[PDB]
Design an enzyme around this catalytic site. Structure first.
Site, PDB file in Angstrom:
ATOM      1  N   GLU A  31       2.567  -3.131   0.062  1.00 41.40           N
ATOM      2  CA  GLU A  31       3.065  -4.433   0.512  1.00 41.40           C
ATOM      3  C   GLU A  31       3.301  -5.377  -0.670  1.00 41.40           C
ATOM      4  O   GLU A  31       4.334  -6.049  -0.738  1.00 41.40           O
ATOM      5  CB  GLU A  31       2.088  -5.066   1.517  1.00 41.40           C
ATOM      6  CG  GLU A  31       1.884  -4.243   2.793  1.00 41.40           C
ATOM      7  CD  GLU A  31       3.135  -4.159   3.667  1.00 41.40           C
ATOM      8  OE1 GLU A  31       4.247  -4.446   3.178  1.00 41.40           O
ATOM      9  OE2 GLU A  31       3.004  -3.793   4.851  1.00 41.40           O
TER      10      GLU A  31
HETATM   11  N1  LIG Z   1       1.080   3.970   5.318  1.00 44.21           N
HETATM   12  C1  LIG Z   1       1.791   2.896   4.960  1.00 44.21           C
HETATM   13  N2  LIG Z   1       2.349   2.872   3.732  1.00 44.21           N
HETATM   14  C2  LIG Z   1       3.072   1.799   3.372  1.00 44.21           C
HETATM   15  N3  LIG Z   1       3.340   0.688   4.066  1.00 44.21           N
HETATM   16  C3  LIG Z   1       2.768   0.742   5.284  1.00 44.21           C
HETATM   17  N4  LIG Z   1       2.825  -0.210   6.276  1.00 44.21           N
HETATM   18  C4  LIG Z   1       2.096   0.295   7.323  1.00 44.21           C
HETATM   19  N5  LIG Z   1       1.582   1.478   7.088  1.00 44.21           N
HETATM   20  C5  LIG Z   1       2.000   1.774   5.796  1.00 44.21           C
END
Ligand SMILES: Nc1ncnc2[nH]cnc12
Ligand SMILES: *[C@@H]1O[C@H](CO)[C@@H](O)[C@H](O)[C@H]1NC(C)=O
EC number: 3.2.2.22
Length: 251
Positions: free
Chosen positions: A166
């Site tokens: 994120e």
């Molecule tokens: N496994 C994951 N990898 C990256 N972003 C995500 N957002 C939700 N699950 C995720």
């Protein structure tokens, strides 16, 4: 033959963290851009060169190597010691192609946020920061066994997913962490709505004209939940570091 990036929590500072994120943003190798924002490759199916390994190690030397998809920055699995674990929803190509010469296992839960909540890991109640990260690495290593605890793996990956994936996608999240680095903080409604809307934002931005006007506005939220609508690229551009290549209108 993948690219690799490292981050150690030992003597880590808000500066080493930011430099790490920017190294990752480069190794994901986006192609081109939309309105000046780097645009991730649309396709890259060969597991042999479509993943970036992030080597996370704490003060005690415990190490966890996370495999991240270069088209979505999605975490599909990781290796600790001589073992590897993959989310239930990891594609067959990746499961077979990544982390060879390890004892392989497929987790019984998906990698999406709601799948992680099924394992008791909720964004609203999971601390983020350098200590939460040290502990997450520690737990992933401690669970490098047959009888692993899924709740610990879920909460640890939830910390890793937001502090790495994120934050790599959003400069906004990167800085929520940077200026709270030596503390423990939980994402608010603003951080959570951004995370949720990356795909929609990516599609509206890429398909917009020179004026940057969205064909359809995207709803986001302030820290307190109050909604607001993004109707133009420039309204959100300073908060985004990478764009996902979205074909059809997502929803
Ligand atoms: N496994 C994951 N990898 C990256 N972003 C995500 N957002 C939700 N699950 C995720
Ligand atoms: C969203 O805002 C409400 C108050 O309006 C607050 O109680 C809640 O904790 C916030 N959500 C999160 C998880 O930050």
């Amino acid at each position: 033959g993948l690219d690799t990036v490292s981050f150690s929590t030992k003597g880590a500072t808000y500066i080493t963290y930011v430099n790490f994120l920017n190294e990752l943003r480069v190794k994901l190798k986006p192609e081109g851009n939309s309105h000046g924002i780097p645009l991730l490759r649309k396709k890259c199916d060969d597991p042999g060169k479509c993943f970036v390994l992030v080597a996370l190690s704490n003060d005690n030397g415990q190490l966890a190597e996370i495999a991240i998809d270069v088209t979505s920055v999605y975490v599909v699995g990781y290796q600790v010691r001589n073992r590897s674990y993959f989310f239930k929803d990891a594609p067959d190509a990746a499961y077979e192609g990544l982390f060879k010469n390890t004892i392989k296992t497929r987790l019984h839960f998906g990698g999406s946020y709601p799948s992680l909540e099924g394992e008791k890991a909720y964004r609203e109640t999971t601390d983020l920061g350098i200590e939460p990260l040290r502990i997450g690495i520690k737990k992933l290593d401690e669970n490098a066994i047959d009888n692993y605890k899924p709740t610990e793996i879920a909460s640890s990956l939830l910390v890793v997913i937001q502090m790495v994936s994120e934050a790599a996608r959003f400069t906004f999240i990167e800085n929520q962490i940077r200026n709270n680095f030596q503390q423990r903080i939980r994402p608010a409604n603003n951080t959570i709505s951004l995370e949720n809307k990356w795909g929609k934002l990516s599609f509206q931005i890429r398909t917009s004209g020179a004026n940057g006007m969205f064909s359809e506005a995207v709803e986001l939220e302030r820290a307190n939940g109050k909604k607001y609508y993004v109707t133009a690229v420039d309204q959100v551009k300073p908060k985004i570091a990478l764009l996902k290549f979205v074909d059809k209108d997502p929803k």
